[PDB]
């Protein structure tokens, strides 16, 4: 199952594109949430989505900064999906194709890129 | 408290040397295990270590490869120590907490160091 | 010698704190400039500062965005200081000059952070 | 024009294949060198190729290790190709993929791949 999570601090932002992008990548059930990404403790919609998705399912978002503007909280969420065997994907940067010749290096880089994108989210707040 | 961990793939190596590096670094209690290093699930002794350590404690090892030679399993192990707030210090690369003045860049580089070291473990096997 | 570079695009920007942060880290001579960071071909002071520094000297700035808001051009400047045996230094990142483990792992991470900051600089401009 | 650079630390290493990879990727002139890649001092054939190649051209290699087995030198040789407007292509790596709607990020990705391969190159040496 493909679960999508869309978030916006305000409707001033384009919720269309975010919702359309999630749906374009085959998002079955999508959890929208109008809240700040400064924390995950006041966003019950996201907490309900994470507890929803289980093994085999796919959790996708338009971009990491939507998942949260807090490095540790974003990183904790990424490893929760890993330990729960839920594939994390981004509409902006899917990264489903091979970049480096080595399979181990690709995992390292894709894990690195996400950490880089995770920091920049807090780097902007 | 400061807990350590030592592993030996083959007893032919200097196990007594590794056990000294932990005490020299300030290890009070040291757990010892003898396994291949391919999977952490078949290593109960290592599991007893991660469970014994609590919040505020310090988990140390001679090197990351001792912890494991599987990138995903090693990263999973480190995160387990993060959420439990246990500092994972390496005797091989003696680096201090707060590697940089900036809090965010510190969190990013702390995680990056462990990923790079973990990527070397599987790289060398 | 320890040369410092400070840049402001607007008169609103607090140039004082930038100069005081540079002096705090041992800046003896500073090259202040009032120009947009979207390019370097129109910044003669930044280039006279890069020429002034020699092998062993220290080129310090407050933030990477001060160096410029163009990724390719900021990276070009960072390597120029590299190839010229000049250490780049940033007030925003205290203790950046330290070594994090072996020199290799340090040279890989420090270079990554600067590129990320160099990317964020341009990303905020346009 | 596409210029290649092949290197072999020893004749035991497969050279006739490394030439085929370069020629398979459209190399017109291949500079062959025979010496360690720890430093660019004892590798004049490389500098001969680097000085030879100029604006518009394309510089290709089998992999990063051929371009040098040192992070500081690899990154130095990479930026030398940037400043001369010469694109660097590695036969080992695939075609990558488009970062749709973010040209700035592609500039950063291509640099990250080189630094990872560069570090990994020096890591395998020891």
Question: Key terms for this structure?
Answer:
homotetramer; 125 residues; Rossmann fold; four-stranded parallel beta sheet; 5 helices; 46% helix; globular; dna binding protein; Conformational flexibility
Explain what you see.
4 copies of one chain form a homotetramer. Chain A is of the alpha/beta class. Chain A has one domain: Resolvase, N-terminal catalytic domain (Rossmann fold). Chain A is 46% helix and 15% strand. Chain A contains 5 helices and 4 strands. A 4-stranded parallel β-sheet of chain A has the order 2-1-3-4, sandwiched between helices. In chain A, strand 1 (2-7), helix 1 and strand 2 (29-33) form a beta-alpha-beta unit. Chains in contact: A-B, A-C, A-D, B-C, C-D. It is classed as dna binding protein. Keywords: Serine recombinase, Conformational flexibility, DNA binding protein. It forms a tetrameric assembly. The entry is titled "Constitutively active Sin recombinase catalytic domain reveals two rotational intermediates". Chains A, B, C, D: Sin, putative plasmid resolvase dimer.
């Amino acid at each position: 199952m493909i679960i999508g999570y869309a978030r916006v601090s305000s409707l001033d932002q384009n919720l269309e594109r975010q919702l359309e992008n999630l749906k374009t990548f085959g998002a079955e059930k999508i959890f929208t949430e109008k809240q700040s990404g400064k924390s995950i403790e006041n966003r019950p919609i996201l907490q309900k989505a994470l507890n929803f998705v289980e093994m085999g399912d796919r959790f996708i978002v338009e971009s990491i900064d939507r998942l949260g503007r807090n490095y540790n909280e974003v990183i904790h969420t990424v490893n929760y999906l890993k330990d729960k065997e839920v594939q994390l994907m981004i509409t902006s940067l899917p990264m489903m194709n091979e970049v480096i010749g080595n399979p181990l290096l690709d995992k390292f880089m894709k894990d690195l890129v996400i950490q880089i994108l995770a920091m920049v989210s807090e780097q902007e707040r």
